[PDB]
Design a protein around this nucleic acid. Structure first.
Ligand SMILES: [Zn+2]
Lengths: 37, 111, 57
RNA sequence: UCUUUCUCGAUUCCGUGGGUGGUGGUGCAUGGCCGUUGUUGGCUGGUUAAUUCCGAUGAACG
């Protein structure tokens, strides 16, 4: 019963997933450059 | 956007989800999710079921609590030991909350 | 000290240097956006593509 | 900006006017709008000693 409940919970999680559905540093640097360029 | 909804855990879980199968309450959900609280240390899914059992546990299953207090307690000691060895916050916080609910409702009790 | 504006050099028959008579006298850039006519500037030490800034040396 | 040719193609660029002028400055009439000359109710997150901090987040009466 616990295994069946776990399978049902996994199916519910999959259904919810269906229902809901290095450059950062350099571009933050050029952001700080262009903020007061 | 989804927390403020009436169907969410804000209001309706506190009212109609406590009636597990039409009768409030059944810990068969709690005892069935042992396979999730065992051998799975994934965050943000343990926290959700911990929050849900924290809210559901308040609706007085008192003779069942007195009966399987041993099962709940051993489950909780393995939960706190694993979480203290791991070092998370949310799951520990609501397992403390459900400890509070269980000990308020009810030798090993001193432990 | 007045700054004079830059004037583009009006070169005579800029088209008439990439072809013979048939073939391409200059290289072709192998990029995705550029090709089949985007000729390749051949400077005395290098080659440049004038659209998407390709650089070979 | 000074060389060396690669590309974009009408999205143009040179000169002369005692001719206006417009991202102009300024005053008047001019339409809207503020302030100006009472009374009773009503929590996902990290953080601190701490209901600590930030962070999301209504009414009538004269
Ligand atoms: Zn090219």
């Amino acid at each position: 019963l616990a295994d069946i409940i776990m399978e049902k919970l996994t199916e519910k999680q999959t259904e919810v997933e269906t229902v809901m559905s290095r450059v950062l540093e350099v571009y933050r640097g050029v952001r700080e450059v262009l903020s007061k360029y | 956007a989804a927390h403020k909804e009436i169907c969410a855990v804000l209001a309706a879980v506190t009212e109609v989800i406590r009636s597990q199968g039409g009768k409030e309450t059944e810990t068969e959900y709690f005892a069935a999710l042992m396979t999730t609280m065992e051998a799975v240390e994934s965050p943000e899914s343990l926290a959700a079921v911990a929050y849900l059992l924290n809210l559901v546990l308040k609706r007085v299953p008192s003779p069942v609590l007195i009966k399987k207090f041993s099962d709940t307690s051993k489950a909780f000691m393995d939960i706190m030991s694993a979480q203290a060895s791991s070092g998370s916050t949310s799951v520990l916080r609501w397992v403390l909350s459900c400890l509070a609910t269980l000990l308020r409702k009810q030798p090993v009790t001193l432990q | 000290p007045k700054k004079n504006k830059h004037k583009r050099k009006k070169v005579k028959l800029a088209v008439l240097k990439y072809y013979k008579v048939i073939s391409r006298l200059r290289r072709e850039c192998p990029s995705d956006e550029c090709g089949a006519g985007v000729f390749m500037a051949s400077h005395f030490d290098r080659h440049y593509c004038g659209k998407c800034c390709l650089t070979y040396c």
